[PDB]
Amino acid sequence: HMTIPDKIKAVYEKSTCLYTSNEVEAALDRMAIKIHETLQDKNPVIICVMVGGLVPLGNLLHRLDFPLEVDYVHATRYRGDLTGGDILWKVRPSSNLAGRTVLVVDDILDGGITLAAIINEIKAMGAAEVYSAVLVDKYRKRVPNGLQKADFVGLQVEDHYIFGYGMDYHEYLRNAPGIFIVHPDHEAS
Amino acid sequence: HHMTIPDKIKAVYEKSTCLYTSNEVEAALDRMAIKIHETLQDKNPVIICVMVGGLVPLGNLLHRLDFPLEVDYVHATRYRGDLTGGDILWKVRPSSNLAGRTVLVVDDILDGGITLAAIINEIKAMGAAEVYSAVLVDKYRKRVPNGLQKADFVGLQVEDHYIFGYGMDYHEYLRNAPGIFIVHPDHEAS
Structure with missing residues (x-):
């Protein structure tokens, strides 16, 4: 029968490139400058939001020229859970975050209900300050209970079906070198 | 208010010696990517990050790999006294979905590799068809019983220095240093 990797190849082959890898790297450079201005003297814990972060x-980390520690977190949500109150935790924020400045890093702000719940849970562990960074923001799309703004944003995009540079298409294509849009043939509407 | 950990971190970084520049590291990743492609492009691998060093x-490696793949992660710790890897503490375990899959395990450094070998063996025990190992740096002259004996993919071979950077920490700091650096003997005596 038809293979998942063959279908992935077809999706990627028919996709359209929204941003080159070079443009993405350039957006990371800009983020880094801003993050430095804000955080350089704060000894932050930088938390990766798995798996997309x-x-x-x-790629961002070696651009950040100040003392910092790294950690990670993993939460999932049912789409039907509109509040973010039924979140499924796989890896919880640690107690070590108490009194720390924390920067939470994810691939994309798309509504951000789940990102907002993660942030609030970090606050509940006693963090002093929580910032958010996102490689891509779907800037026109905002939802109740969602994160209204990220502190640091690489690229602003319209509401496309996108993958690459950490963003998956059914777990695949996080390794695509740029930002891509799924062809209308493969967009299940 | 006394000297802080971050202040000491700055001093370590300032006195450290650069072994490899960021450019040399990127070039090593390019070489690894080519090797990984030749061996794995047709294998539909799960690529597993060994947290946090991986x-x-x-x-950085991922966007150089031009073939279908999935990503996952694992996390395990070890007492320095546990020379066997029989008593490793799991924080995040390999999943049962790895059954019948080709898996590539990625870590920062092969330094003995006792924990790394235990992780690999545990992935085999979940039924993976094949396990490959990739490491940014290998302390190629240091091998220990129960440790990983050879990695399939190695970016850079180094001597047994105190090193940090590019994902390798010095007491949880300095993973963000842009290259591979050696800690000055005034901060780390042998």
């Missing part, structure tokens, strides 16, 4: 965070 | 090397 991993590519952006790893 | 995160920067993996993130």
